[model samples]
Target chain A: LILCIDVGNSHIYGGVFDGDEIKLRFRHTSKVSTSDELGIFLKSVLRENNCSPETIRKIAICSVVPQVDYSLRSACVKYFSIDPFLLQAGVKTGLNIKYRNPVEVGADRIANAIAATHSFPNQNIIVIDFGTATTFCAISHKKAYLGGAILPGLRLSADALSKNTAKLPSVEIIKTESVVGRSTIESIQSGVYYGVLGACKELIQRIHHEAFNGDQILILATGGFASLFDKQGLYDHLVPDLVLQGIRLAAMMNT
Target chain B: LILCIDVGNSHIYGGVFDGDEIKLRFRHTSKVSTSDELGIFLKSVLRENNCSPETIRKIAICSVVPQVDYSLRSACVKYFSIDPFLLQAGVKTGLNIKYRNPVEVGADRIANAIAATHSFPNQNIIVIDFGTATTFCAISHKKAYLGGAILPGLRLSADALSKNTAKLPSVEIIKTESVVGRSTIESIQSGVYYGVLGACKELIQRIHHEAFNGDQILILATGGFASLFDKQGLYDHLVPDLVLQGIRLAAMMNT
Candidate 1:
């Protein structure tokens, strides 16, 4: 069994892979944690899944937030008795990064690109992650990572509106039937819902125009807010475990 | 001369209106202030505009921030020697508010609808105010104030993204030529720029579909970030002093 973890700004997603199939999946909030805490938590998770800690042969990680990386590494080494492989620049991602500074490209984005290319080869792809920030990465048909766009996530925008303003209340995100809201709550819900949807659609369309030159492109979406975009016609495929899959593949390539 | 003030969550916009024409416009950051502080500030602003405090015969205000409204009223009374007219629910706006609860609508939004209806009568209008909160107000051809959407402003979203995330840095708001960002800075710029634009366009389209029934609708845009949406062809008219004009109109209707 292999443990693959994708650490984002808000949450850390983990998957236990037996061969090519993901056997168990779990998530933890991304925050400061001691090695002991993380190690104990991982042990419990594995135990709950009917797997022993001794069965874990290798651990792989791809993290965007740098502060929690050390804790994750120490937890794996102390508990699993393995030195975890960290995804970074110069790794065998199987996709060439065409960024001006390839090292500056996010590790999770590279993982998404790698997993996307492996899943659907010879196709232009835009992988969108609706995490702490709404991110879009464009990969060419030749499997070259060609940069992307980043916007504030839906929850971030909604929270900002309530926090910065004096009277506006915090709103629950819901899809509204009407665009013109008759109440304050409805207005906020409509704004956030359509705001994210509109931005994603526009970015996808613009990415196609600027990067793919109006060619056919497949949009692959992932992250916490992926379900909000379901059946919106903006995404061709929804791969919730794309980053975890990529982390597993990276571990395979490194070994 | 009439002093018209529109108080928002972030900034307070002031305009010196001479009859139907605006003579000068100024803005101040919205914060808690004593009557003396606000009085002194207003006096200096009037002096800078080459107008004496005695020339101001009346004062009008529309504020969303309730805490500052008392100080504003007191400032007008002490410094300008005039009782200020506060625009609120039950006040004459010359437009019927079709909201389920009319009083819940922001005073600034109501002012915008009033000014828009007066400026262009017998036309279905969408008034976009890009302030601390990006607000939209829909007015029917019969001068009915229909409620609209409210999203966080571009600057607010950018600020929130930097504050919430550990890795993402504070970015300047600028328009990028392409939607596919080649660098981190460019990616954030494109996202904020295109995100707001896309959201506005989608809300307008949705408003037209749900409310106007695909009829021809005139879009009127205002506030500090109005110019950003100018060339995008989303707005038919750009009224920079729309809120101020509404304050003046509100005062006239009451008198």
Candidate 2:
């Protein structure tokens, strides 16, 4: 079994993969973790899932937050006794990054691109990740990593609205029955739900038009809000552990 | 001359209206101020606009932020010697409030609705205000204030993205040539610009569909970022002083 960890700005996602299938998964808030804390947490998670830490053969990681990278790597070595494969610019992604400065492209985005291309072969694809920042990455049918857009995530924007305003209260995001809200809470809920939905649709449509000439493009969505968008019929595929899968794939390529 | 003050969460907009026309306008950050400070600021604004305090016969105010309202009212009485008309739920808006709790609606939204209904009579109108919070207010042709949506403003969302993320830098909101950004700066710029634009378009479309039944709906946009949406051809009308105009009209109906 292989342990895969995807660290984002807001949350860290971990999955234990048995071949291509994710056997167990867990999530934690992304923070600066001590080596001891991370090691114990990983051990406990493995134990809770009825898996032995000794059975883990390798560890793979892809992190957008750099501060927690050292701790995560240290945790894997100290606890699991394995040198984890970290996805960075020099890693073999099997997809050519077409960004102006390839190093500036996020490792997670490249991972998503690689995962999408592998999942849907011989197709033009756009992968939308609903993380702390909603990211869009476009990959050509020939496996080229074309650049994409990044916007504020739904939760981040919602929190910002309540925090910055004097009277508006923090509200949970839910689908409102009507576009015109009858109350403050409903108004905010509708705004966030539909605002993000709109942004996703627009970016998808525009990206499809500009890059693929309105060709049949496969849209893959992942991350925490992937389920929310799945109901909206916004994606051709939904892969919740896409980054983790990509991490595993990258690990295999490098090894 | 009529003094119209529209206080938002981020900025206070003051407009000097000569009858139906807004002759001069100024803006200040919305903050707690002493009576003397507000008074001096108002006097200076009037003087700079080549207008005298004696010419100001009435002051109309609409505020979403409650903290600065008292000082604004005091400034009017002490400096201009007129009791300002602060817009509240009971005022004669010429539009029936259909919201669950009418008072909970932002005063600025009501003002925008009133201004739109007056400017474009007997037409279903959607007023979009791009202030600290991007607010949408829907009004029926029969002069009823149907509710609307509220999202974080473009600047607020952009600021949140930069602040929350360790690596993402704050970027200006500008229309990018392509939706597929080639760099991080361009990616953020495209996202904020297109994200808000897409949200506005979606809300407008949804409101029109849900309420007007494909009827001719007049979309009026206002506030500091109103001009940004002008080029998109999304709105039928762009009334920069829509809220201030509503304040002026509300003052007339009450007085």
Candidate 3:
């Protein structure tokens, strides 16, 4: 089984793939600072899922956060006894990046491009990853990786509202039916949920207008919070494990 | 001369009002913890603006934050020798509230409604305050305060992104001409600005649909960050000192 990890800012979303099929999925906090901490946690999750840690032969990782690199790399080698393929600038993504500086594009975004271009060949695509950040990547029908917009995620925005403001309370993030919140809780729930939904709708429309002359573009929704927006019919497909799939694809390409 | 103070979560927006005329305005951080600290600061700002502290006959305050109320009231009494009219649940705003609980409405929002309904008579109004929190308050032409939504402000959202995330950096908040950010800074700059602009537009339209049935409702933009959205031509009137005016109006109505 091939182990693929997508290290995000707040959490690490990972999946174990057996050939072409995903065997299991797991999540862990990004607060894991030590090699032993990450290593033991990985082993425990793998073992608990009825998969032997020793069965993992290849490991691939695409991390947005740079600080966790040392410990993560150490954990892979020491615990798993395998040198992992780190998805970075030099990795073959196959897709051409049209960003101002090609190398400036995020590794995770590059992974998104690879998986998206590979899966939905020859069609305009916007890959929105709703992780710590809500990011939009525009890949044209010509297979060029065009840059997109990034915003703070729903949870991040909600946490900021409560933690920074004195009067505002921490609210449960939900897609409230009422646009007008009568109470403090309802107001926040409405704002964060609809704020993101509205912004995404507007930005997507703007992107469509500017890039494809308002043509029908496929939107692939990925990440933890994308489910909240599923009901809006804003996205074409929900690929929760897109990042991990991309990491696996990139690893196979290099090897 | 009446000193009208609009205490926000992030800053104290105060003004010296000469009857209907606003003479001088000043802003200070909300970190004034002690009565003496607030007393000295208020006096200094008044004096610096060529206004005497003793000339301040009445002090009116509309605060959402309860922690600063004690120190603020003490500052007014000790420094200016005036018992401030704290705009609370009991205050006379002349605007009926349609919230689930009338008292659950924020005093700042109440102040916004008071100033709005008073200024623009016989019209549907939506007040958007861009401060520590970006709040929307809907009011009917019948002089009633309808409920609205609240989200984290631009600065607060940006601050949250940098502080909470490992990879993101603090960015200068602005409306970028380009929707697609070529760089990291541009991405964040575009996201925060357009995200807010798009969301606000969508919410306003939704409110217009739900509340007014797409009637010609007046949009009143207020608070410190409202100017950033001024060029968008979204608001009918820009009332920067609306909350202070409301506090001033509420103070006059009672006595």
Candidate 4:
């Protein structure tokens, strides 16, 4: 059994996988300043799920939050007695990165990329993660990971709306019934939902025009908020465990 | 002489209009906790522009910030010695509001609608204010103010991205040469600029489809950041002083 941990800006996701199958998954707030607390919390979570902490033979991590890295590593070494395989710089992702600075890309993005490339081999794919940030990654059929765009996350944008404006209050991100809203709440709902939808549509079209050039491309989406945007039927595949799977594969390869 | 003040979330915009012509304009932060400070600051701004504060016959305001309203009114009454005409509920704006609650429409949006209706008589128009919050208002040829969408402002989105992300830094909002960014800075730049554009385009198209149907609608753009997006030629007309003009006309109509 392998334990894969994916740390994003707002939340940390943990998944327990048995070879090619996921056995359990747990998520918590991304805040962790103490190694002891981190280890205890993670162990408790696994125990609560009926998965023994001792059975976690390998630990793999893909973290975008650098501040939480050292503590997480300490937890893995001290509690689990195993050094974690970090999907960072110098890791073999099996994909050629075309970014100006390859290290500039986040580890979580690379993990998603590795998962997408593996699942859909020999295909032009666009992977969008609607997580703490709405990120897009374009990978060619030739195993080249081209750079993509990044927009603020849905929840992040909603929170920003309430925090920044004097009159606008915090509203839930839901698909509004109408395109134009007649109330303050409805207006925000309409704006945020359709605003995100339209931006994605526009960006997708632009990416297709600029990169694909009549070459067929698959739009893959994964993240906490990705399911909420399924009404448009834009994404061809929804893989919620893609990052965990990538981490698992990475740990196995480098180990 | 009429002094028109428009209070948005981030900034307070002041205009000195000589009947049909704007003689001076000034802008400052919307932070005002005291009436005396507000009155003094406004007077100083007018004086600095070589326009005597005493020459102001009337003060007209259209504000979205409710907390700053009482102080602003007190300032006008104390400094200018005239009761300011607030474009609030029950004001005689020459447009029929079709919102679920007429009061839900902010004063600035009504001002935009008034200015747009007056400029394009008996023609369907969509007024987009790219202000502290990017708001859309659809007014029909029959002077009916239909409610529209409201998204988080451009600068606000950028700020949220920098503040919320772990490693992402603050970047300037600029047009990037490429859609797919090769670096963090370029990625953010591309996303913010293109994201706003795409959202606007999508919202605009939806408004046209749902409300206007087959009518030829004129897309009118205004506010501080409207000129920056002139690249795509999406705007039919650019009126930076739209809110000011509406406030001036409201004062004249009421007086």
Candidate 5:
């Protein structure tokens, strides 16, 4: 059994993987979860999956939440009886990141690239991930992790519209029939849905046109809202649990 | 003779229209021009066009600059000897604004809708005036002004990217050869161009889909940086001097 953890701003996800497949998964709200509470939850999840804590041979962790790293490490040490393999400087992964500062790259992105490489192999890859901000990551044909762009995500943009303005109300993001929204709700929907979809298509097309020269490059979609917008086949492949897969693969590589 | 003043964010444009044609035009930076300087500048422009204060009849003003409205009104009173029919609560333009708060609608939008109605009569129209904020104004088939959306203009988005992030540099709003910019400047270029274009496309499509159904909606593209992304026929009509024309028509309506 392999243990993989992905920590983001809003929540933390823990997965017990049997090879490439996620056997069991657990999610917790970031603000409410304590170190001891995490340990208890992990133990319960593992037991429910018919796996013991001692049965876990290796563990890999990727986190964007910097404040909780120490507590997470402590939780692993106390309950799981394992030293967590932290993804940081000098980590032995085959991907060569060509960022100005490698450490500056977000953990979610690093995981996305690694998992993308495993699926697509040796071709230029563009990974569009939707998180706090939507990002456009480019991996060269030679497998170098070239830096990409960060823009306001759909949810964040929607939140900004409501929060920054006094009158505008928050609405669910959806595909509307018209840009001329008859009512306030429909207008908000039009703004959110079309805004994100438009941002995605244009950015993807621009990247595809400029970056790669040979055969058509593969585009991978991952993140919280990846599958929602993937219906139009804008993305080549949809890997719903990409980060978890990366964590498992990283553990295998290190072991 | 009628005076038309368009006070935008960066610059203030004033013109004298003889019948329907703009006889004289003047532009000055918004930050530097005082009431006296503005009045003198208008005098000089009118003189250059072989006209004088005696020919002027009435004035129509469509100003977005709240700080400079008084100054513009003062300029009109001091030099032009005409009481500017400021686009506010008491204007008799014969257009019904169906917004929840009639006063909150920008003067530019009112001008755009009025211009649109005059040009494309009795049609459900969406005027996409690309100004400080790329605005979408909706006018029903009945010719009533319904409120629309305000999105970040192309240059504003790029300026925001550079301003918010320390490392990212500002680039031209035009599309680059490649999506994969060789450097940070190119990357920003790709993001801004593609991002905004996408937003425009999606919003247009959505508006067409449901709200303004088969009403032959005419998208009037105007403002600085309008020509760059207005290609591929996203906009139905391209009027470089839309606001100025609208102000002229509004003046005509008053007389």
Candidate 6:
């Protein structure tokens, strides 16, 4: 069994992998899960899944939120007795980054692009990840990672809207039959639902028009709100645990 | 000659209307022009257009920058002897606003909507105005003024992007063939151009989806960068001076 952890701004996700298959997974709010708490939680989850600490051979970590990197690494080293391979400046990432400054490319994005190249090699791949900020990562057909666009995440936009505008109320995101909302709730839904979809479509189309010189590019969407985009069929591949899968792959190669 | 003033956040625009047709126009940076300066500029411009203070029969004011309203009005009253009909509260706007609170509607948008309804009457209308903030006003088929969405203007977003980010340089908004730009200028353009277009399309689509009754509605675009949206064809009308026109119309109907 392998422990693969992805620490992001919103959540800290852990996946247990048995060979290539993801055996079990757990997610906790990124801030709430401290180093010791995370280690204990993982141990308990692994135990419940019939996987002992002895079965875990290696730990791999990929993170976008830079602040929590050391603490997460400490949890792996101190509690699990494993020296986690942290994605950093000098790691042997197999994929080539075509972006102007390779270091500027986000670690999580790099991980996704690397996973994409390994899984769907030699194809134009667009990875749409919803986190603190919604990111659209563009990868060329030759498996080179191109820089992508970043916009405020759906919930982030909603949160800002509710906070900034005095009269407006915070509402849950939902899909509607059309854009012409009759009420305030529908108006909010219109913004969130169609806003995300339109952004995805525009980004993908622009990527195709300028960046990727290939046949048909593949769009992969994953996150908590992946289901919001299901109606558009904009995503060619939908994976809920892509980061986990990437983590497993990272653990395999690193160990 | 009807003196029309459109007061925006950063600039104040003055237009000389010869009945329904505009004869000349003038603009001044908002802060730079005091009451005395505006009066001087107005007198000089009118004289240049072969008109005097006596020839100017009426004046109409549409002010979004509330602070400058009194200054401009004072300029007009002192110079032209025409107490400029300030388009604010208690001004009789003929259009019926069906919102829960009609007074809450921004004077600029209401004026624009009223003008839209009169010009393109009996049609579902959307008015997209680009200024410090890009605003989308929807007037239903039945001519009731519905609420609208307001997002950051393209230039304002660019200003913000440059301000917030460490290394990114501020770029002027322009049309680009690519969304994935290799350089900073193209990158900023791609972001602003696509971001705004997507925002408009999505917001409009959401609006239509909710109404569920209107035909292909008449959409209109106006304000500082009115021509920026010429490619979109989303708007039925492109009146760069719609707000000023509304002020004129309102003045004609009232005092």
Candidate 4 residue lDDT tens string, A10-110: 88999998888998998878874445446766777888789888898789999998878988998788668889999989977788899999999988888
lDDT tens digits by residue: candidate 5, B1-255:
778888889778777777778777787777533354456556666766789765887788888877788767876776667778877666766689988988888888888888888888877887787767888777887778978778988778889988998987777767555878888888888877777777788878777766776556777788876787655788887887888988888767776
Write model 1 residue lDDT over B1-255, tens digit each, in one string. 899998888888898977888888888978736564567678777877799877999889999998789778977876677999989888887878888998898888888888888888889999998878898888899988879888999889888888998888899876567899988778888998898999998999999998898998999999888888777898999998888998888899998
Error of 3 at A110 (Å): 1.1
Candidate 3 displacement at residue A68 in angstroms: 0.6
Stretches off by above 4 angstroms in model 6 are A1-255, B212-214
Worst 10 residues of 2 chain B by lDDT: B41-50
Best by lDDT: 3
List candidate 4 stretches off by more than 4 Å. B1-255
Restricting to chain A, the TM-score for each candidate equals: 0.96, 0.97, 0.97, 0.97, 0.93, 0.92
**What lDDT does candidate 3 reach at residue B206?**
93
Tell me the tens digit of each residue's lDDT in model 3 across B134-223.
Answer: 998889999878798999999898999999999989988776887799998998888999999998998899999998888889999987
Error of 3 at B185 (Å): 20
Estimate, for each residue in A95-157, the C-alpha lDDT of model 6 and write its tens digit: 778778888887778777777767787678889887678888888877777788998888997
Global CA lDDT of candidate 6, please?
0.78
Name the runs in model 1 displaced over 4 angstroms.
A1-255
Residue A157, model 5, lDDT: 81
lDDT of each model, Cα atoms only?
Answer: 0.85, 0.84, 0.86, 0.85, 0.78, 0.78
DockQ list for all candidates: 0.01, 0.01, 0.01, 0.01, 0.01, 0.01
The fraction of correct interface contacts reproduced by each prediction comes to 0.00, 0.00, 0.00, 0.00, 0.00, 0.00
Q: lDDT per residue, candidate 5, A60-131, as tens digits?
A: 889898888887888888887788998766776678888989989987788877888888888889998776
lDDT tens per residue, model 2, B97-122: 88899888888788888878887898
